[PDB]
Amino acid sequence: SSAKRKQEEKHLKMLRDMTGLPHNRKCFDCDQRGPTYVNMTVGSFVCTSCSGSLRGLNPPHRVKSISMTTFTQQEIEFLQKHGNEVCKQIWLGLFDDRSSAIPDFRDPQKVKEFLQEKYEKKRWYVPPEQAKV
Amino acid sequence: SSAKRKQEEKHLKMLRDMTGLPHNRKCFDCDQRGPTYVNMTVGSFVCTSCSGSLRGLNPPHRVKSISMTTFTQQEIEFLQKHGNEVCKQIWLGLFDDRSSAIPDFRDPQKVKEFLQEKYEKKRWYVPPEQAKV
Ligand SMILES: [Zn+2]
Ligand SMILES: [Zn+2]
């Protein structure tokens, strides 16, 4: 459908507005490369390797392909209200970019433990209400 | 690079602005389905099957994948000044959508002859200077 097409392409335009924002240009979890997936659980943009590790959490985070998913209006709007800068202030609100503890990202076991500390144990976490203000 | 990323994502945002315009939602040549390629020779949005036939013209038209090409700023701006509505007024300026001669698009030989009439012999053509005014 053309009406279907119209909304689909609008969502992709909105998506590419977001993928060009500076914090969204690098994976939220490793900061080492460009994102290929969105992590819908928290509203971040992540790379494939980190997406694989996020699926190893329990419960696992929900990742969807940037290029292949047909995102809904609800999902696009959630992402607009989140993204990597908003997420940084929450999940990494206490993290110091110079020296806070990061894994060797070539190691899946260490990346798992790190993602657990980040999201489950909330080692560097500032609650969203505070983070926003 | 992040600066590289920024321009790349900007171009994709600009591209998706165009792919959502009503005339761009259908292949410029067959009007039968959604476009997957841009025809850079004329500035249109076309489907895969028509792209295959466009490559059979001599000289052939230059088609590039919507999803896989890294378009340049120059290319994006050309497309912004063209697209399927602008192209309709030129290449189909004399064509009647109710009854002008179209091929069975399931037939490659007939599609070739049609594209020759459209682009080479200019059967339905209005020059761009007139078409614009
Ligand atoms: Zn990553
Ligand atoms: Zn076509």
DSSP for B62-89, written as a single string: -EEETTT----HHHHHHHHH-HHHHHHH
Compute how many other C-beta atoms are within 10 angstroms of the C-beta atom of residue B119. Answer: 18
CA B132 – CA B128 distance, rounded (Å) = 6
What's the rounded Cα separation, in Å, for the pair A17 and B13? Answer: 6
- Got the DSSP string for A66-83? TTT----HHHHHHHHH-H
First-to-final CA distance of chain A: 43
Instruction: Considering only the beta carbons, identify the residue of A17, A25, A26 that sits closest to B13.
Output: A17
Q: Taking CA atoms, what residue in B is nearest to A35? A: B5
| Strand (E) or helix (H) holding B46 | strand B44-46
- Nearest by Cα to B76 from B1, B2, B17, B6: B17
Contacts of range A58-62, beta carbons closer than 8 Å, 24 or more positions apart: A61/A119
Q: How many CB atoms lie within 10 A of CB A72?
A: 11
Q: How was this structure determined?
A: X-ray
Q: Contact at 8 Å (CB) between A14 and A73?
A: no
Residue where the block lists tokens 């005339």: B23
Residue B130 CB: number of other CB atoms within 10 A? 10
Give how far Cα A126 sits from Cα of A89, A91, A95, A122, Å: 7, 7, 10, 8
DSSP letters for A1-70: -HHHHHHHHHHHHHHHHHHTSGGGGS-TTT-SS---EEETTTTEEE-HHHHHHHTTSSSPP-EEETTT--
Token duo for residue B34:
């959604």
Alpha-carbon gap, residue B15 to B2, rounded angstroms: 20
- What domain range includes position B109? 1-133
Largest CA distance in chain B: 52
**Number of independent structural domains in chain B:** 1
Lookup result for tokens 């609100």: A93
Contacts of B87 (CB under 8 A, 6+ apart): B28, B42, B43, B44
Do strands A63-65 and B37-39 pair parallel, antiparallel, or not at all (unpaired)? unpaired
Which residues are CB-neighbours of A65 under 8 A, at least 6 positions away? A36, A37
Residues followed by a break in chain A (C to N exceeding 2.5 Å) are none
N- to C-terminal Cα distance for chain B? 43
Query: Can you give the CATH number for the domain in which B79 is found?
Result: 1.10.220.150
- Report the amino acid identity of residue B87: C
Tell me how far apart the alpha carbons of residues A28 and A44 are, in angstroms, rounded to a whole number.
6
Q: What is the resolution of this structure in A?
A: 1.5
Exposure letters A101-122 (e unless 16+ CB within 10 A, then b): eebebeeeeebeebbeebbeee
Kindly identify the ligand whose nearest atom is closest to the C-alpha of B51. 2
Number of H helices, E strands in chain B: 6, 3
Q: Is A65 on the interface with B (CB under 8 A)?
A: no
What tokens does A22 get?
A: 């500076």
Find the closest chain A residue to B16 by CA distance: A13
CA of A50 vs chain B CAs: smallest distance (Å)? 19
Residue B92 has a CB neighbour count (10 Å cut-off) of 21
| Residue in chain B nearest A34 by alpha carbon | B5
Q: How far is B55 from chain A (nearest CA, A)?
A: 26
C-alpha B82: how far from chain center: 9
* Non-local CB neighbours of B8 within 8 Å, separated by 6+ positions: A20, B70
Closest of B111, B45, B103, B112 to residue B78, by C-alpha: B45
Give the residues across from B44 on adjacent strands. B39
Listed residue (B19, B43, B45) closest to B31, CA to CA: B45
Q: Which chain B residues contact residue A8 at CB under 8 A?
A: 20
Q: Are A121 and A94 in contact (CB under 8 A)?
A: no
- Are A22 and B6 in contact (CB < 8 Å)? yes
* Main-chain phi, psi angles of B61, to 5 degrees: -80, 150
CA distances from B100 to B121, B123, B124 (A): 15, 10, 9
Alpha-carbon gap, residue A5 to A29, rounded angstroms: 33
Ligand 1 centre to CA of A13 (Å) is 24
CA of B49 to the centre of ligand 2 (A): 6
